[PDB]
Amino acid sequence: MFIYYKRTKQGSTEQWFVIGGKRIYLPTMTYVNEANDLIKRYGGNTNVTTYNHDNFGLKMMEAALPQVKV
Amino acid sequence: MFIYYKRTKQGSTEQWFVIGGKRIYLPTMTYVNEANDLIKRYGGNTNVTTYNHDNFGLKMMEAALPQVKV
Amino acid sequence: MFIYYKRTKQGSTEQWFVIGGKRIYLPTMTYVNEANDLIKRYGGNTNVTTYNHDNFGLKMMEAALPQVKV
Amino acid sequence: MFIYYKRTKQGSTEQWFVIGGKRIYLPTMTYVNEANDLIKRYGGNTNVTTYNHDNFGLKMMEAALPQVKV
């Protein structure tokens, strides 16, 4: 599990949480805090990387990790 | 793999087992024991955390980890 | 990734390979060897455990890890 | 996450990226570079192994890890 940042085409920065082979968009700072709590408890990765929307690394992550909504 | 606890709306506490990107409700103490045996054998996480039913961390785990029944 | 053994109802012992959240029955010693090669290369778990067909730990693994055929 | 090489029946060598329980064919050196960047950031495995198309280890990986396209 880890969090990454996504710089959108419209300019905003989104925080996304990878868990269980899935991707979750974090809509509020309270969701961000709880995701970081999960990372701390379950040995997740504390790396934070910001990806431009067109970055190939981001694209491969979005292809392999289905989005789920909370 | 790890176990967590869930405090239900009706007040009970459920034990859940995360494995293979899935969630398993543990119906008996014998299932709990065997799950902890799996954790010990395969390098799982021994963290035990109790989540209120409405906690956002729990909610993200339930969204990303499909339930399977045993 | 890891291998486990399953003692079947008819008495035989099957070797199974867990990878990618899936279970693979290993039909020959050549498949067993190649699976152990994968374990050695990709940091898998070298634990070998034998499960009776009715063991609850095995049952939870079979519920959470879909079988795929090779 | 890790990269492996596949020696095809027609003789070419393909680079594949394993992430999230999925397999991604890497079509360009820029995709290879970004995949290795992901490996470095998220604690992936730096092992590089070349598999002949008929190798049983490769076959089990292809059975257990669905291909996704980028």
Residue numbers in the entry:
A (entry chain A), B (entry chain A), C (entry chain A), D (entry chain A): 168 to 237
Task: List passages from the publication reporting this PDB structure.
Endolysins are hydrolytic enzymes that specifically recognize the host cell-wall and cleave the peptidoglycan to digest the bacterial cell-wall for release of phage progeny during the lytic cycle, which is why they hold promise for the treatment of multidrug-resistant bacterial infections as an alternative to antibiotics. LysIME-EF1, an endolysin isolated from E. faecalis phage possesses a highly efficient lytic activity to multidrug resistance E. faecalis. PSI-BLAST search predicted that LysIME-EF1 consists of an N-terminal catalytic CHAP (cysteine, histidine-dependent amidohydrolases/peptidases) domain and a C-terminal CBD (cell-wall binding domain). Our finding provides structural and functional evidence that LysIME-EF1 belongs to a unique two-component multimeric endolysin encoded by a single gene.
Ultimately, the dataset diffracted in the space group I422 was proved to be LysIME-EF1 CBD and the structure was solved by molecular replacement method at 1.75 Å resolution using the CBD from WT LysIME-EF1 as a search model. The CBD comprises a four-stranded β-sheet capped on each side by one α-helix. Crystallographic symmetry analysis suggested that LysIME-EF1 CBD forms a stable homotetramer. The oligomeric interface contains 1318.9 Å2 of the buried surface area, accounting for 28.25% of the monomer surface area calculated by PISA. The LysIME-EF1 CBD was cloned into pET 21a(+) with an N-terminal His tag and the purified LysIME-EF1 CBD was subjected to size-exclusion chromatography and the elution profile is 17.7 ml in a Superdex 200 column (GE Healthcare) with an estimated ~32 kDa, supporting that LysIME-EF1 CBD forms a stable tetramer in solution. Detailed analysis shows that the tetramerization is mainly mediated by extensive hydrogen bonds and hydrophobic interactions. In addition, a sizeable hydrophobic interface is formed by the neighboring protomers, where the residues M227, M228, A230, A231, L232 of α2 helix from one protomer pack against hydrophobic patches 183WFVIGG188 and 191IYLP194 of the other protomer. Differing from that of LysIME-EF1 CBD, the elution profile of the LysIME-EF1 CBD F184R&Y218A is 18.7 ml, confirming that the residues F184 and Y218 are essential for maintaining the oligomeric tetramerization of LysIME-EF1.
